[PDB]
């Protein structure tokens, strides 16, 4: 996260870190047995780390659980990043508490102008590389599709939405992928892609979760 702030230990209880010997993506806990992330974060042998703040220090509230199965969206297109969403089922149910909680799925889609919270352990520099060990936070608004496309020239589908500041300076970045975008208490987006980080007229692009509620619910009910 670029231009954000230190969230504070466990203030984002649904935030998860996907670990394959090292942190490589974020994710969101939607219930005791399931986590949602981006399809481009797919990897074999994933260990889900919940209740994390400093990812390099055992602080006492962590739960390390291996993934039993991963399901990438049936129509995920790695070239355009369309349908960039994936579900991960935990080998065992997580213990829910004040530090580890689930985030609600949306009922309706969020509209332009709505403020959202984006979090992650990704790069903090727009130019250069500097990875934080503690969770970073960023409040950013949803931009209208027209405003986004006109300014960025990005090729976006109806399964994506932009959020951020056209003036630049604040944005998600590498390492934040798969992370949550929460607006009004609901998971409305997943950190998906963009052009560089925090650049002018180049806001972040996120997977529009409200378009996948049916798939998510049906998949978890049958698995």
Statement to judge: residues 34 and 93 lie in one domain: yes
Q: What is the resolution of this structure in A?
A: 1.6
Statement to judge: residues 153 and 66 lie in one domain: no
Statement to judge: residues 113 and 187 lie in one domain: yes
Statement to judge: residues 67 and 95 lie in one domain: yes
Calculate the alpha carbon distances from 14 to 103, 126, 208 in Å. Answer: 6, 26, 18
SS3 120: strand
Residue 188: its H or E element: strand 186-193
Statement to judge: residues 7 and 53 lie in one domain: no
Question: What is 21-74 written as a DSSP string?
Answer: SSEEEEEEE-SSSEEEE-GGG--SS-EEEES-SSTTS--S--EEEEEEEEEE-T
Calculate the alpha carbon distances from 169 to 124, 139, 140, 212 in Å. Answer: 11, 12, 11, 30
Statement to judge: residues 87 and 110 lie in one domain: no
Statement to judge: residues 139 and 222 lie in one domain: no
Statement to judge: residues 204 and 141 lie in one domain: yes
**Residue 107: Cβ-neighbour burial (10 angstroms; 0-12, 13-18, 19+):** exposed
- What amino acid positions are annotated as catalytic residues? 40, 84, 177
Statement to judge: residues 216 and 203 lie in one domain: no
For residues 11 and 188, give the distance between their C-alpha atoms in angstroms, rounded to a whole number.
Answer: 18
Tally of domains in the chain? 2
For residues 81 and 221, give the distance between their C-alpha atoms in angstroms, rounded to a whole number.
Answer: 26
Method: X-ray
Statement to judge: residues 108 and 143 lie in one domain: yes
Taken as a whole, the chain contains a residue count of 223
Statement to judge: residues 111 and 194 lie in one domain: yes
Whole-angstrom distance between the N-terminal and C-terminal Cα of the chain? 33
Question: Which domain range does residue 118 map to?
Answer: 1-12+103-210
Q: Which two tokens stand for residue 20?
A: 């394959």
For residues 131 and 129, give the distance between their C-alpha atoms in angstroms, rounded to a whole number.
Answer: 7
Calculate the alpha carbon distances from 158 to 32, 76, 144, 145 in Å. Answer: 30, 14, 12, 9
> Where does 81-197 have alpha helices with state H?
145-152
Q: What is the DSSP letter of 192?
A: E
Phi, psi (rounded to 5 degrees) for 67: -85, 135
Statement to judge: residues 180 and 195 lie in one domain: yes
């Amino acid at each position: 996260i670029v231009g954000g702030y230190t969230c504070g230990a466990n203030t984002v209880p649904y935030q998860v870190s996907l670990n394959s010997g090292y942190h490589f993506c974020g994710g969101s806990l939607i219930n005791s047995q399931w986590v949602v992330s981006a399809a481009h974060c797919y990897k074999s042998g994933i260990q889900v780390r919940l209740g994390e703040d400093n990812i390099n220090v055992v602080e006492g509230n962590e739960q390390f659980i291996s993934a039993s199965k991963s399901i990438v969206h049936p129509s995920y297109n790695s070239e355009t990043y369309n349908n960039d969403i994936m579900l991960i089922k935990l080998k065992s149910a997580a213990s829910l508490n004040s530090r580890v909680a689930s985030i609600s799925l949306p009922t309706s889609c969020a509209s332009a102008g709505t403020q959202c919270l984006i979090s992650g352990w990704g790069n903090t520099k727009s130019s250069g590389t500097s990875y934080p060990d503690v969770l970073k936070c960023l409040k950013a608004p949803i931009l209208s599709d027209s405003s986004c496309k006109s300014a960025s020239s990005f090729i976006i589908t109806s399964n994506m939405f932009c959020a951020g500041y056209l003036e630049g300076g604040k944005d998600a970045c590498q390492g934040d992928s798969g992370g949550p975008v929460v607006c009004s208490g609901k998971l409305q987006g997943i950190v998906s892609w963009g052009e560089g980080c925090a650049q002018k007229n180049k806001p972040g692009v996120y997977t529009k979760v409200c378009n996948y509620v049916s798939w998510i619910k049906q998949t978890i009910a049958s698995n």
